Each structure stands twice: as C-alpha cells, then as structure tokens.
Symmetry: none
Subunit: 171 residues, 2 copies
C-alpha cells in the first residue's frame, strides 16, 4: 500500500537538541517555510495527521485538510520530554540509537510505540499522506531495513509493509 | 512481508539428540558464541522471541530486546521431553516424520502447535526478526514448500507468506 509519511517542520527544540514527544510546541518560521515547500510536492491523496499542532500546521501549509489521529503522534518520552539529547543517560541514548529496549518512566515503551504505529498503518484501506513525527517515520524506515532518520519537513513514500519507494527532501 | 526466523543457539540436548520443547534449558558456551555471531548479520527489525531462556538469551547476545510471546515456543513434547530421538518409539517417530498428526502424552498436539504459530505469524503488522525454535522454523519453511535444514544459531529470511528470501547458516 503506497503511503507517504511526512515529518513535520522544525520547532525550536530541533536546533536545541531536546526530545520532543507529546510536548506541544509550535513550528518556527523556518518550520513553516519547510511546510510551504511541500505544497505541490506531495500527491493529492487523503490526508491523516497527528493531532499535535506542529503536525496539523505542516499539513495545512502543505495544502491539506487532514483527519486527526493521536495514533500518529511521536513516542511519549514521559519524564524524558524536553531532556537534552547531549546529557541523556548512555542507556537511553543507546536504546534510542539501536531503537530497542526503551521504556522511559511515565512514558511509552518503544515496543508499545511500534504496535501503535503499525496498528494504525494496518488499518489504512487506501493510499494516503500521513503528517507525523520523526520517530514514526524512523520506526517505519527501520522496519523496512533502512536508516530511519529524515530532516524536518521532509517526506518518504513506502509500499507498506514491503519497501521504501522514495525519500523527498526540499531546499 | 520480511520475516527472519532465527533458531536459538545450541543447548546440551541438541548435541545429545534429545527432544527439546518446553524444557527450559540454557545455551551452552558454543550456543552463546553462535548467538553473538548473529549480531553482525541480522537486520535491525522489530524483534520478538519465544519466552524460553535459550531463545531470550540468543536474542540478547544477537543485540536485540524482543517482545516475548509463548506462541513462538517449540511444541510441548509432554512426557517425551528429553527423550532420545534415536530410541523414540516408532509410533511417535513415524507420527513426527509423517507430519499428518501428533499428540504426545501430557503434551501438545501438532494442530494446537500450528494454530498457535500461524495465528502469531498472521498477526504480525510489520517486518520482524523472530527468535524461536527448530520446529517453528521448520513449520514456516514447509508452509513455503521447502525442507527444514536450519542448524542451531542459524536463520532463514522469508517474504511471508510467499517464499524464502535467503538462508543464513554461520
């Protein structure tokens, strides 16, 4: 099933290097700029978006009017929300880097996050554009055997659950 | 959808030739070495594992933190757990070789085993690495029209439920 996943534009915490999950921060000026560049670059398919403001705003500026689903949210970092990546305990860094065995206190485990995301993707009955977050795109890319790190405001199209079709980045 | 079926490393009953199902044996030193060797080959896909110690330990040494599922367990041989294959009564040996039916005393039936394994596989929602047992790997290979020559600590990748992608015997 052809699915286009879009990572929302940047927020201040991208440059600041802080974990941003369920914390609701707005797009920066550049983030809105990145979002506008997506208009006319994404297929005119039904759109779905995380309910987080930054995701919804990206969809809007991209020319879409998506249906909202919290299932498309970034992983819930719990007590690690807002924590600087730099000072993150090596155990957490490793868990996130290897994408496994991550269970932040007060948050969502990586295993639970993957189930949520993959369960949502399984329910899609037709090609769609999904406005979501870096961790969601990463989970999908890694499940498809590829490095799952993509720039804010970029997109990837996949033939779920078989292979990646294209990675789209705009300058 | 890509699935990697990984057979746990060897235990003492493998070299001794004894039926090993729900008996929770640990890996031997060589079994652990086999597990470590898998770290440099298996793709970093979501991982799942039988809850048996030998499977869990194989996953850990291969560099994974799997979600545990008893559905990935080898069949329960009941009273036949630990029985030497070489002296297995013809009634059971034939049953296991015919693949038409099997139900050892105090054990699990082939039918229950299959319901178990296939329900699990059919429920997967994304590619994955599955740390399991010989009987499970064999069940998958046979469902794809292939034999089942996968030694301990080795793996087979399949495009489920269509065909085998590649075999990895280290």
């Amino acid at each position: 099933m052809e699915l286009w996943l879009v990572r929302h534009g940047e927020t201040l915490w991208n440059r600041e290097g802080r974990l941003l999950g369920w914390t609701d921060l707005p797009l920066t000026a550049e983030g809105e700029a990145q979002a506008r560049r997506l208009k006319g670059a994404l297929p005119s398919l039904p759109a779905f978006s995380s309910d987080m403001l930054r995701a919804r705003r990206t969809a809007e500026l991209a020319g879409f009017s998506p249906r909202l689903y919290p299932e498309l949210r970034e992983i819930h970092f719990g007590a690690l929300e807002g924590a600087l990546w730099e000072t993150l305990d090596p155990r957490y860094k490793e868990a996130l880097l290897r994408f496994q065995g991550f269970h932040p206190p007060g948050g969502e485990s990586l295993s639970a996050f993957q189930e949520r995301v993959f369960r949502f993707l399984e329910g899609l009955k037709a090609p769609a554009v999904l406005f979501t977050h870096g961790g969601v795109v990463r989970a999908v890319l890694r499940a498809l055997g590829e490095d799952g790190l993509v720039p804010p405001g970029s997109a990837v199209a996949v033939d779920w659950p078989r292979r990646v079709l294209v990675r789209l980045a705009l300058d």
